């Protein structure tokens, strides 16, 4: 039975979807256990128009597993513990010299400028999580567990692996930004390299 | 199998 | 030592060597061999040990008084395909007999299990059950 | 053009105008640090996006076996005859079939378009 | 002066320390005795405009290790110790980083293969049983 | 084993990496996990391919891919990757030589087989992802031999082009002289024949 | 059609719904006949 | 796939077109309109070109080479060296300076190739932008003799003054963010 | 002079045991860490388990179940989940507070990747002139937290509901 390759980042463009470019990665825990969990990093299209929306233009969002609502990406990076904007961009953008990629990242930074606390970001992730959250403490611990295990399991599942997850998430964003700029070609689903 | 205007 | 214009013979000699060593259905056989040899044992080892204790039995002082039972599976063993008759006597099962008598071609699966009892009596006993 | 991060809080500096002095100040929202802006340009957008791909080309691509190589076009910098030549290889490159030559031979790393 | 206070005297004295990445065979050779107070000699030779660092394995221990330096300007490193008396202290600031590499190229792969086999010993595999257990 | 070797061969781990240094160095992915970066990619790539051809640490199924334009080295040890064996070309000369086919010809009473050919480094298994980085010659003698220059950097050669066909299409005689839908139809009809 | 130097008589759109909103139901009868005839006769086939 | 190049247009034919006609879909896959020219415009290719320009949607984004938002406290200061001459000429007899001058500046460069291809005029674009945004935008346009076509836009001088004693501390979008929103709206929906 | 051709060679000593364990403290270059202003510092294990692990089971635990009800209460809580984890400090991150509350605060996290095939040693100058090598027990990466006003979580939720903040965000931060 043919299946799409796990533990790889694929960037596709979906016309119908509101996201102009979507990058998906299906992660499995070294095939040892657990179902494959897919995390999507998407860039909203500039077609949507508003006084603030047109100014921000393209804004990156992330569809973390087991969280019902889309989460802004800077909030995910802050949830992992990288609060400073410069450090988040260091993970996302490998060379700060290029202006176009930084311009792409700027709107998503503006959208998440309300949240500057790691605990607050975790609470926000828990609150928008599909599973109900009774209190702030419970929501924070639940969202931390989701980030530790459910999201990007192949990079790590335990052992304080937040930095590795942050780097791989930033790689996913970097590839999405490169596709949006046009520097990398969008991946093809039919390639048999991808079809395990 | 012929050309672009023909058949595949 | 280059092979010029003798290539038609040489390419088919190497192709023949490939097909002699590796049959046409090598992929299925190799995948199943990997399953049995490695994946079954790894699945047994990956499973967390079973931890069991009583629910405050006897309503006594209950200073961890309920015993703790710990089970750990290990060292999976597979036998050759075997058919047990109505008499209960084990006997090897040839594939053609399975086809004729509508039997299933299967092999027994055995696991070593280690059971530890911790009753807070200052002694823990680790009995081992071989080839369960 | 470029984005400047404040030293005090390591966050992005957003443009701000001081009405009293009519001086552009890059000030973080989170922290009070303010910096005068030398560039005096806030936002630049190139709709034509006529950006040369010579800068983006990596010199490492010369090692690729699959790339075609021409000895017809000599290198300008060092005169090495071989030069792998390839097209834009870029999405949103509009309609350009220009060949972006890259000189072979170790450490020359010269990229020219004819 | 409190329990949580960090003794920054090493930082004040600006004590310089060197960080080195060394392989497992060397560390295990050192750990074998680990109590003789001696494992080898570090020899540094400097020229007009080039410096080389090398480590010689002790003759008793064996029964050449060139060192490659790494730039430390991209990241600032310091060393701190947690005393058994709950008195945290700082030893110094890292001013140089180095890596230790094996001298043997191919025969060293033989020792690497032996190490791989040793690490694969705890790995357990399904065992074929000739006779069904009764 | 591949991760251990990569640590030995001057691969800085992501944890120890200064974020600025990533930009100028290739990223090494093993089974889809970004293990680290390497400052000098080509030497590492050649060493990995040598190890695989000698079958020392890297198994034959393991595939190494280097995307030169994107500064990424990807190593897949995953299961389910489909591979086909290809002859190896060094310079413009096939590595397969008359001594190898002489030993294979007397395959009986010489215990020389395909596994010996794989271990010798004459042939190699290449998956599609690695096929993207490989220059192939359909026929060795014709393409390798010097002519009007088309490619002088062939890295692999096809054993025989007729091996692209499967089991049912291999029984078709002179397949290249038929229309393609007819070969497709014969592939289905041959399954229904009597014998 | 309103633009100067555009013939109001002969200018036609392929969309039948636009023809209905602009020109009426009888015009759509004729336009739908024309479009169906075009799709049928492109291969050269003829339907009465 | 097997139409011809004679059409020189995307055309839906065959079964999909039959389904479109049969289902009376509101949105055809390829809506098309055949325009027949009335008189001399049909005879002469140049007049037909004029009609084409009249019938084809054109926005500022199509004719704009690049847009840059600058901060210039003084219009006479002319932070950009190039605009010194024409800004000085315009401010020799300044218009709307009495109200105020907005410090933030939007500088738009228009590609000459696209401008002459659609036969647009700098004065025409200035008039259209002025009409679209009323007096909220003040536009300065170069002469056509200038090698680089430059259009300089600033926020309303009356709005910059706010013409209000209370002045309201709302400070919506300040002026830079408002200028960015104006730039996006102009590029998307100018309909020149 | 002798500096152009100096050759220095020193003995290496590896004591079997040291009273103080050796760790690595790594600061990011962009943080611009400076020790001149470090008059005092406080390094201690974190208490974030207050928020997410312990003393969170304060009120319901000491509510006052007794007798059969006590037995059932304990057993029910235990079987409901898998016994909530309490403080095990040695396996928790480190919090650094330089110069008390006034100065910057850093957080160190143990390097998750273990060095199963690597070891790190530190060479320190000593009066005897011989290098001493000490194994690295742990690696910690410290990242600072700005000593700026932090948005309250409830206020942050209220603001995020108005995701379309047409008004300037800087004024909003000033209001808080
Ligand atoms: Zn700041
Ligand atoms: Zn050159």
Distance D29 CA to ligand 1 centre (A): 8
Tell me which chains share at least 3 CB pairs under 8 Å with chain I.
Answer: A, C, D, E, F, H
Whats the size of chain G, residue-wise?
A: 48
Ligand number nearest to the C-alpha of D82: 2
What 3-state DSSP class applies to A26?
strand
Nearest to I38 among E8, E55, E88 (CB): E8
Distance CA A125, CA A75 (A): 8
Closest chain I C-alpha to F64 CA, distance in angstroms: 23
Distance I169 CA to ligand 1 centre (A): 14
Show the 3-state SS of chain H.
CCCCCCCCCCCCCCHHHHHHHHHCCCCCCCCCEECCECCHHHHCHHHHHHHHHHHCCCCHHHHEEEEEEEECCCCCCCCCCCCHHHHHHHHHCCCCCCCCCCCEEEEEEECHHHHHHCCCCHHHHHHHHHHHHCCCEEEEECCCCCCCEEEEEEECHHHHHCCCCCCCCCCCCCCHHHHHHHHHHHHHHCCC
Q: Which secondary structure element, helix H or strand E, spans residue D45, and what is its range? A: strand D41-45
Closest chain C C-alpha to I79 CA, distance in angstroms: 9
**Exposure b/e, E33-67, CB count within 10 A at least 16 = b:** eeeeeebbbbbeeeeeeeeebbbebbeebeeebeb
Question: Largest Cα–Cα distance in chain G?
Answer: 39
Interface probe, candidates A45, A46, A49, A55, chain H, greatest H C-beta count within 10 A: A55
Q: Collect all residues of chain G within an 8 Å Cβ-Cβ radius of residue H54.
A: 3
DSSP calls for chain E = --TTB-BTHHHHHT-EEEEEEE-HHHHHHHHHH--SS--EEEEEEE-SS-EEEEEEE-HHHH--EEEEEE--TTEEEEEEEE-TTS-EEEEEEEEEEEEE--S-SSHHHHHHHHHHHHHHTT----EEESS---
The environment of the single-atom ion ligand 1, i.e. residues with CB closer than 5 A, is D 6, 8-9, 28, 31, 33
Total domains, chain H = 1
Distance CA A95, CA A101 (A): 9
Q: Which residue has the tokens 């839906």?
A: H12
Domain edges within chain D: 1-45, 46-114
Among candidates A73, A55, A49, A52, which has minimal Cα distance to A63? Answer: A73
Asked whether the beta carbons of E69 and E79 are under 8 A apart, the reply is: no
Distance CA I39, CA G42 (A): 89
Q: Which secondary structure element, helix H or strand E, spans residue A24, and what is its range? A: strand A19-29
Q: Collect all residues of chain A within an 8 Å Cβ-Cβ radius of residue C42.
A: 32
Q: What is the dihedral of CA D89, D92, D97, D103, to 10 degrees?
A: -40
Does residue H45 form part of some domain? no
Q: Residue I154: which region, alpha, beta or left (left: phi > 0; alpha: psi -120 to 50)? A: alpha
Domain extent at residue H160: 50-192
Question: Largest Cα–Cα distance in chain I?
Answer: 89
Asked whether the beta carbons of G19 and G27 are under 8 A apart, the reply is: yes
Q: Which secondary structure element, helix H or strand E, spans residue C5, and what is its range? A: none
- Written as six digits, the tokens of C98 are 């399975």
Angle value at C-alpha E44, between E41 and E50, nearest 5 degrees: 160
C60 touches F at CB < 8 Å:
no
Distance CA A116, CA I150 (A): 7
A54 contacts H185? CB cut-off 8 A: yes
Q: Which residues contact residue G15 at a Cβ distance below 8 angstroms, ignoring those fewer than 6 apart?
A: H28, H31, H32
Using CB atoms within 10 A of its CB, is residue E13 exposed (0-12), middle (13-18) or buried (19+)? Answer: exposed
Asked whether the beta carbons of D26 and D13 are under 8 A apart, the reply is: yes
- Written as six digits, the tokens of F133 are 């980085």
DSSP calls for A42-87 = EEE-TTS--HHHHHH-S-EEEE-TT-SS-EEHHHHHHHTT--SHHH
Q: Residue H73: which region, alpha, beta or left (left: phi > 0; alpha: psi -120 to 50)? A: alpha
I124 contacts E46? CB cut-off 8 A: no
Half-sphere exposure of D31 (CA within 13 A, CB side): 19
C42 touches A at CB < 8 Å:
yes
Closest chain C C-alpha to E110 CA, distance in angstroms: 25
Fold of A8-196: 3.90.1110
E16 contacts I20? CB cut-off 8 A: no
I84 touches A at CB < 8 Å:
no
Q: Which residue has the tokens 């395959």?
A: F107
D68 touches H at CB < 8 Å:
no
How far, rounded to the nearest angstrom, does the alpha carbon of residue I153 sit from its chain's CA centroid? 22
Residue of E nearest to I135 (CA): E27
Distance D31 CA to ligand 1 centre (A): 4
Distance A54 CA to ligand 2 centre (A): 46
Among candidates F169, F166, F159, F123, which has minimal Cα distance to F138? Answer: F159
Distance F46 CA to ligand 2 centre (A): 24
Closest chain H C-alpha to B7 CA, distance in angstroms: 7
Q: Collect all residues of chain F within an 8 Å Cβ-Cβ radius of residue E113.
A: 56-57
> H154 - beta bridge partners?
H105, H138
Angstrom CA distances, F16 to E19, E97, H20, stand at 13, 12, 61
Q: Collect all residues of chain A within an 8 Å Cβ-Cβ radius of residue F15.
A: 163-164
> F67 - beta bridge partners?
F72
Q: Collect all residues of chain F within an 8 Å Cβ-Cβ radius of residue I136.
A: none
Chain H contacts to G (CB-CB under 8 A): 13-14, 17-18, 21, 24, 26, 28, 30-41, 47, 51, 54-55
Residue of I nearest to D31 (CA): I148
Bridge-based pairing state of the strands F72-76 and F33-38: unpaired
Question: Largest Cα–Cα distance in chain H?
Answer: 71
Q: Residue C131: which region, alpha, beta or left (left: phi > 0; alpha: psi -120 to 50)? A: left
The structure was resolved to a resolution in Å of 5.8
Tell me: is residue D9 an annotated ligand-binding position: yes
Q: Which residues contact residue C8 at a Cβ distance below 8 angstroms, ignoring those fewer than 6 apart?
A: none
Using CB atoms within 10 A of its CB, is residue F4 exposed (0-12), middle (13-18) or buried (19+)? Answer: middle
Write the DSSP symbol of residue I69: H
- Written as six digits, the tokens of I9 are 């060679």
Among candidates H11, H23, B3, which has minimal Cα distance to G42? Answer: H11
Among candidates F6, A177, A83, which has minimal Cα distance to I28? Answer: A83
Closest chain E C-alpha to F15 CA, distance in angstroms: 12
Distance CA I141, CA C88 (A): 66
Asked whether the beta carbons of F137 and F144 are under 8 A apart, the reply is: yes
D1 touches H at CB < 8 Å:
no
What 3-state DSSP class applies to A37?
strand
Whats the size of chain E, residue-wise?
A: 134
Question: Largest Cα–Cα distance in chain A?
Answer: 49
Does residue H115 form part of some domain? yes
Please, which experimental method was used? cryo-EM
Asked whether the beta carbons of D25 and D18 are under 8 A apart, the reply is: yes
Among candidates F139, F46, F142, F144, which has minimal Cα distance to F92? Answer: F144
Residue of E nearest to C37 (CA): E126
Distance CA F153, CA F92 (A): 7
Q: Which residue has the tokens 């031979």?
A: D105
- Written as six digits, the tokens of F10 are 């001057």
Asked whether the beta carbons of I18 and I65 are under 8 A apart, the reply is: no
Distance CA H15, CA G42 (A): 11
Q: Which secondary structure element, helix H or strand E, spans residue I24, and what is its range? A: strand I21-28
Question: Largest Cα–Cα distance in chain B?
Answer: 10
Distance CA F36, CA F38 (A): 7
Specify the CATH number for the domain of residue H182.
3.30.1360.140
Angstrom CA distances, A12 to A41, A185, A189, D30, F129, stand at 11, 9, 8, 36, 18
Q: Which residue has the tokens 């070294």?
A: A30
D17 contacts H174? CB cut-off 8 A: yes
What 3-state DSSP class applies to C11?
helix
Q: Which residue has the tokens 């299933």?
A: C104
Phi–psi pair at D38, nearest 5 degrees: -75, -35
Bridge-based pairing state of the strands A60-63 and A71-72: antiparallel
Angle value at C-alpha E6, between E4 and E9, nearest 5 degrees: 155
Q: Which residue has the tokens 């403080």?
A: I87
Q: What share of chain D is helix, strand, coil (3-state, %, to 5)?
A: 5, 30, 65
Show the 3-state SS of G1-48.
CCCCCECCCCCEECCHHHHHHHCCHHHHHHHHHHHHHHHHHCCCCCCC
Ligand number nearest to the C-alpha of D27: 1
- Written as six digits, the tokens of F1 are 């084993």
Asked whether the beta carbons of F144 and F94 are under 8 A apart, the reply is: yes
Q: Are chains E and D in contact at 3+ CB pairs closer than 8 Å?
A: no
Q: Which secondary structure element, helix H or strand E, spans residue I12, and what is its range? A: strand I7-13
Asked whether the beta carbons of F30 and F36 are under 8 A apart, the reply is: no
State the CATH architecture for D46-114.
Answer: Single Sheet (2.20)
Chain H contacts to B (CB-CB under 8 A): 1-5
Edge-first strand order for the sheet with H149-155 is D41-45, H64-71, H104-110, H149-155, H137-141
Write the DSSP symbol of residue C31: H
H188 contacts A55? CB cut-off 8 A: no
- Written as six digits, the tokens of D64 are 């690729």
Residue of C nearest to E129 (CA): C79
Closest chain F C-alpha to E63 CA, distance in angstroms: 23
> A19 - beta bridge partners?
A44
Q: Collect all residues of chain I within an 8 Å Cβ-Cβ radius of residue C56.
A: 71, 74-75
Q: Which secondary structure element, helix H or strand E, spans residue D43, and what is its range? A: strand D41-45
Distance CA G34, CA G39 (A): 9
What 3-state DSSP class applies to C129?
strand
Write the DSSP symbol of residue F177: G
Angstrom CA distances, I45 to A144, E90, I26, I87, stand at 19, 17, 17, 10
Domain edges within chain I: 1-176
Distance H80 CA to ligand 1 centre (A): 29
Nearest to F18 among E75, E102, E116 (CB): E75
D12 contacts A85? CB cut-off 8 A: yes
DSSP calls for A130-192 = SS---SHHHHHHHHHHIIIIISSTTT-SSSS-HHHHHHHHHHHHHHHHHHHHTSSPPP-TT-T
Distance CA I72, CA I162 (A): 47
Asked whether the beta carbons of A72 and A88 are under 8 A apart, the reply is: no
Distance CA I99, CA H105 (A): 46
**Exposure b/e, I146-156, CB count within 10 A at least 16 = b:** beeeebebeeb
What 3-state DSSP class applies to C42?
helix
Q: Which long-range contacts link E57-62 to residues 24+ away (Cβ below 8 Å)?
A: E57/E26, E57/E29, E61/E29, E61/E30, E61/E32, E61/E33, E62/E29
DSSP calls for I117-164 = T-EEEEEE--TT--EEEEE--EEEEEEEE--S----HHHHHHHHH---
Distance CA I155, CA A115 (A): 10
Tell me which chains share at least 3 CB pairs under 8 Å with chain A.
Answer: C, D, F, H, I
Distance CA I154, CA F92 (A): 70
Distance F149 CA to ligand 2 centre (A): 21
Q: Collect all residues of chain I within an 8 Å Cβ-Cβ radius of residue D8.
A: 146
**Exposure b/e, F98-125, CB count within 10 A at least 16 = b:** eebbebbeebeeeebbbebbbebbbbbb
Bridge-based pairing state of the strands F156-157 and F136-137: parallel
- Written as six digits, the tokens of A44 are 């909203």
- Written as six digits, the tokens of D13 are 């500096």
Distance CA G29, CA F72 (A): 62
Distance CA E87, CA E4 (A): 8
How far, rounded to the nearest angstrom, does the alpha carbon of residue F30 sit from its chain's CA centroid? 17
Domain edges within chain A: 8-196
Tell me which chains share at least 3 CB pairs under 8 Å with chain C.
Answer: A, E, F, I
Phi–psi pair at H130, nearest 5 degrees: -65, -40
Among candidates F9, F12, F74, F68, which has minimal Cα distance to F44? Answer: F9
F22 touches A at CB < 8 Å:
yes
Distance CA F184, CA F162 (A): 16
Among candidates A153, A6, C18, A37, which has minimal Cα distance to F81? Answer: A6
Distance CA H129, CA H139 (A): 8
Distance CA I72, CA D43 (A): 67
Among candidates H35, H58, H128, H119, which has minimal Cα distance to G4? Answer: H35
What 3-state DSSP class applies to C37?
helix
Closest chain F C-alpha to A148 CA, distance in angstroms: 16
Distance CA C15, CA C26 (A): 15
Bridge-based pairing state of the strands F72-76 and F26-30: parallel
E18 contacts I123? CB cut-off 8 A: yes
Distance CA D36, CA D22 (A): 11
Tell me: is residue D6 an annotated ligand-binding position: yes
Tell me: is residue D41 an annotated ligand-binding position: no
């Amino acid at each position: 039975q043919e299946k799409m390759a796990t533990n790889t980042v694929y960037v596709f463009a979906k016309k119908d979807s509101k996201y102009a470019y979507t990058g998906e990665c299906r992660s499995c825990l070294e095939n040892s256990s657990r179902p494959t969990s897919t995390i999507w990093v998407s860039m909203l299209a500039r077609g949507g128009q508003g006084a603030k929306k047109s100014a921000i233009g393209q804004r990156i969002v992330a569809t973390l597993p087991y969280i019902k609502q889309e989460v802004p990406i800077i909030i995910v990076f802050r949830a992992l513990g990288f609060v400073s904007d410069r450090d988040i961009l260091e993970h996302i953008i490998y060379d700060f010299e290029d202006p176009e990629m930084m311009e792409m990242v700027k709107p998503s930074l503006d959208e998440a400028f309300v949240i500057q606390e790691q605990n607050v970001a975790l609470n926000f992730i828990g609150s928008r999580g599909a599973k109900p959250g009774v209190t702030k403490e419970k929501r924070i611990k639940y969202a931390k567990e989701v980030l530790q295990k459910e999201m990007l399991p192949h990079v790590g599942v335990s052992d304080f692996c937040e930095t590795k997850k942050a780097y791989f998430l930033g790689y996913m964003v970097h590839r999405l930004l490169l596709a949006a700029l046009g520097r990398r070609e969008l991946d093809d689903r039919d390639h048999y390299g991808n079809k395990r | 199998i012929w050309g672009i205007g023909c058949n595949p | 030592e280059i092979t010029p214009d003798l290539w038609q013979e040489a390419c088919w000699i190497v192709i023949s060597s490939y097909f002699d060593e590796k049959g046409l259905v090598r992929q299925q056989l190799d995948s199943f061999d990997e399953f049995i040899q490695m994946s079954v044992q790894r699945i047994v080892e990956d499973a967390p040990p079973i931890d069991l204790q009583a629910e405050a039995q006897h309503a006594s002082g209950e200073v961890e008084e309920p015993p703790r039972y710990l089970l750990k599976f290990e060292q999976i063993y597979l036998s050759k395909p075997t058919h047990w008759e109505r008499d209960g006597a084990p006997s090897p099962m040839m594939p053609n007999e399975a086809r004729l008598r509508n039997l299933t071609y299967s092999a027994p699966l055995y696991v070593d299990i280690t059971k530890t009892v911790i009753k807070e009596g200052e002694e823990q006993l680790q009995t081992q059950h071989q080839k369960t | 053009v470029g984005i400047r991060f404040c030293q005090e809080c390591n966050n992005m500096l957003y443009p701000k105008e001081d009405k009293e002095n009519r001086i552009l100040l890059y000030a973080c929202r989170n922290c009070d640090y303010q910096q005068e802006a030398d560039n005096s340009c806030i936002y630049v957008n190139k709709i034509t996006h006529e950006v040369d791909e010579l800068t983006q080309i990596i010199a490492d691509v010369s090692q690729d076996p699959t790339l075609p190589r021409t000895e017809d076009h000599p290198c300008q910098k060092c005169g090495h005859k071989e030069a792998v030549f390839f097209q834009s290889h870029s999405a949103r490159a509009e309609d350009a079939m220009r060949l972006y030559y890259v000189c072979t031979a170790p450490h020359c790393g010269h990229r020219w378009t004819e | 002066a409190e329990r949580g206070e960090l003794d920054l005297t090493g930082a004040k004295q600006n004590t310089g320390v060197w960080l080195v990445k060394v392989p497992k065979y060397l560390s295990q050779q050192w750990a074998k005795a680990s109590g003789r107070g001696e494992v080898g000699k570090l020899r540094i030779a400097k020229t007009q405009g080039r410096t080389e660092v090398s480590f010689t394995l002790n003759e008793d221990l064996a029964n050449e290790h060139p060192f490659v330096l790494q730039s430390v300007g991209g990241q600032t490193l310091t060393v701190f110790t947690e005393s058994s008396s709950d008195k945290l202290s700082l030893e110094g600031i890292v001013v140089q980083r180095a890596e230790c590499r094996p001298a043997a190229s191919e025969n060293y792969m033989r020792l690497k293969r032996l190490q791989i086999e040793e690490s694969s010993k705890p790995v357990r595999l399904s065992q074929q049983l000739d006779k069904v257990v009764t | 084993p591949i991760l251990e070797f990569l640590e030995e061969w001057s691969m800085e781990n992501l944890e120890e990496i200064s974020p600025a240094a990533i930009a100028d160095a290739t990223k090494i992915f093993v089974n889809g996990c970004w293990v680290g970066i390497h400052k000098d990619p080509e030497q590492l790539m050649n060493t990995l391919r040598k190890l695989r051809r000698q079958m020392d640490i890297i198994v034959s199924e393991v595939s190494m891919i280097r995307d030169i334009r994107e500064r990424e080295i990807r190593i897949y040890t995953d299961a389910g990757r489909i591979c086909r064996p290809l002859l190896i070309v060094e310079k413009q000369k096939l590595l397969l030589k008359k001594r190898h086919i002489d030993q294979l010809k007397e395959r009986e009473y010489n215990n020389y087989s395909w596994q010996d050919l794989v271990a010798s480094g004459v042939v190699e298994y290449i998956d599609t992802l690695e096929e993207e980085t490989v220059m192939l010659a359909m026929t060795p003698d014709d393409l390798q031999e010097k002519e009007v220059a088309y490619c002088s950097t062939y890295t692999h050669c096809e054993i025989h082009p007729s091996m692209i066909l499967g089991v049912c299409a291999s029984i078709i005689p002179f397949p290249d002289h038929n229309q393609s839908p007819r070969n497709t139809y014969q592939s289905a009809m041959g399954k229904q024949a009597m014998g | 059609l309103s633009e100067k130097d555009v013939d109001p008589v002969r200018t036609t759109s392929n969309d039948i719904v636009e023809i209905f909103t602009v020109l009426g139901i009888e015009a759509v009868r004729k336009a739908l006949e024309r479009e169906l005839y075009h799709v049928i006769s492109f291969d050269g086939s003829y339907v009465n | 796939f097997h139409y011809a190049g004679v059409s020189a247009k995307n055309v839906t034919l065959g079964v999909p077109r039959l389904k479109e006609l049969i289902n009376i879909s509101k949105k055809p896959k390829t809506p098309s309109l055949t325009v027949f020219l009335l008189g001399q415009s049909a005879r002469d290719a140049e007049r037909a070109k004029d009609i084409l320009c009249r019938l084809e949607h054109t926005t500022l984004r199509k004719v704009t080479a690049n847009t840059a938002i600058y901060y210039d406290p003084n219009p006479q200061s002319t932070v950009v060296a190039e605009d010194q001459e024409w800004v000085n000429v315009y401010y020799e007899m300044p218009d709307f300076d009495v109200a105020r001058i907005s410090p933030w500046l939007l500088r738009v460069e228009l590609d000459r190739k696209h401008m002459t291809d659609r036969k647009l005029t700098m004065e025409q674009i200035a008039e259209k932008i002025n009409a679209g945004f009323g007096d909220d935008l003040n536009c300065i346009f170069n002469d056509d003799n200038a090698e680089k076509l430059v259009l300089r836009i600033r926020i309303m001088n009356s709005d910059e003054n706010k013409m209000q004693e209370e002045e309201e501390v709302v400070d919506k979008m300040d002026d830079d963010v408002f200028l960015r929103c104006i730039e996006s709206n102009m590029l998307t929906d100018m309909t020149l | 002079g002798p500096s152009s051709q100096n050759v220095t060679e020193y003995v290496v000593r590896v004591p079997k045991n040291t009273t103080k364990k050796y760790n690595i403290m790594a600061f990011n270059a962009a943080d611009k860490v400076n020790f001149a202003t470090w008059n005092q510092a406080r390094l201690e294990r974190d208490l974030s388990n207050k928020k997410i692990y312990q003393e969170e089971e304060m009120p319901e635990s000491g509510a006052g179940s007794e007798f059969n009800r006590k037995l059932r209460e304990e057993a029910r809580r235990k079987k409901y989940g898998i016994v909530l984890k309490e403080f095990r400090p040695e396996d928790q991150p480190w919090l650094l507070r330089v110069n008390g509350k006034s100065g910057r605060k850093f957080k160190g996290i143990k390097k998750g990747g273990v060095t199963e095939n690597t070891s790190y040693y530190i060479f320190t100058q000593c009066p005897d002139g011989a290098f001493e090598a000490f194994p690295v027990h742990n690696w910690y990466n410290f990242t600072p937290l700005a000593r700026h006003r932090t948005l309250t979580a409830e206020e942050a939720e209220e603001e995020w509901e108005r995701r379309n903040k047409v008004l300037n965000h800087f004024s909003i931060m000033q209001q808080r």
